[PDB]
Structures are given as C-alpha cells and as structure tokens.
Amino acid sequence: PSMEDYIEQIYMLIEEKGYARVSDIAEALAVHPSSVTKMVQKLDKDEYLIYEKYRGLVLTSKGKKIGKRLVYRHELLEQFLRIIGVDEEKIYNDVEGIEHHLSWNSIDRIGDLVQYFEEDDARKKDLKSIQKKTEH
C-alpha cells in the first residue's frame, strides 16, 4: 500500500480502538508485519507519528490532520459513487483504487457535486431518469 494507505488505516484504528497495533495494521492492509514496521519507520522519520514505550504508535498533529483528510476523502468518494448509482458492491474497491490519485481540486469539485444532489432530491430523480434513457 501507499504511505497514505497506512496513515488512513492507522487513524481509523486509533478512532475505533484507541490504539494501532502493528498486527491490526498488517491485517487491515493484508500485508506482512515487516512491511508495516518499515512503513512505520518512514512515517516516524517524516513526523507523522511517534512510538511510545507504553502507548505504542501515536499520531503527531501532522499525522492526525492527514489521517482525518484521508478518511474524509474516502467517505466522500463512496458517497459520490453511491449517489450516481454505482452498485454498492463495487464502490469500495473503486474508491480504494482512485482515492489517493485525485487532486484536491477534483476532490473538492466532487464534494460540490455531492452537495448538488443532496440539496434537492429532484436532481437525483432526474439523473435516475437519464440512466433509464441511457439504458434503451
């Protein structure tokens, strides 16, 4: 996975559990613990996290800000694909594939588009109309 993938998962585990165990990270990302330990070393050098003797891995403010951004980006992209009518089963893998390869410009414009549909259900109905007309 990418550095972004590791920070995203670490932030989520701290939110869910209160801590991020190397074993939990390894299971979440489907990687070997050694891959995790190496990435953690990298994230420590770049000051996204530190390692305490008693608490284990702890995000710095830099890590927390990035993690929160990454979770937001994930959730937004799922909401986007869901609103435009992608089969739910496909959404997660599509988001995992694209999320870390989009500019903030694109993310923010996708945010505006999500707001566009959420603000008036009639727009959703019209889009549903179009889909039927592109079905033939």
Q: Which two tokens stand for residue 28?
A: 């979440």
Does the footprint of a second copy cover residue 126 (CB under 8 A)? yes
How many other CB atoms are there within 10 angstroms of residue 81's CB atom? 19
Does the footprint of Fe ion cover residue 74 (CB under 5 A)? yes
The least CB distance from residue 17 to a second copy, in Å, is 29
DSSP 134: T
Length of the chain as a residue count: 136
Work out which of 49, 115, 125, 136 binds a second copy, going by CB under 8 A: 115
3-state secondary structure of 110: helix
DSSP 18: S
- 74 marked as binding residue: yes
The enclosing H or E element of 12 equals helix 3-17
User: Mask of contacts with a second copy, 67-106, x by CB under 8 A?
Assistant: --------------x--xxxx--x--xx--xx--xxx-xx
Q: Which residues bind a second copy (CB under 8 A)?
A: 81, 84-87, 90, 93-94, 97-98, 101-103, 105-106, 108-113, 115-116, 119, 123, 126-127, 130-131, 133-134
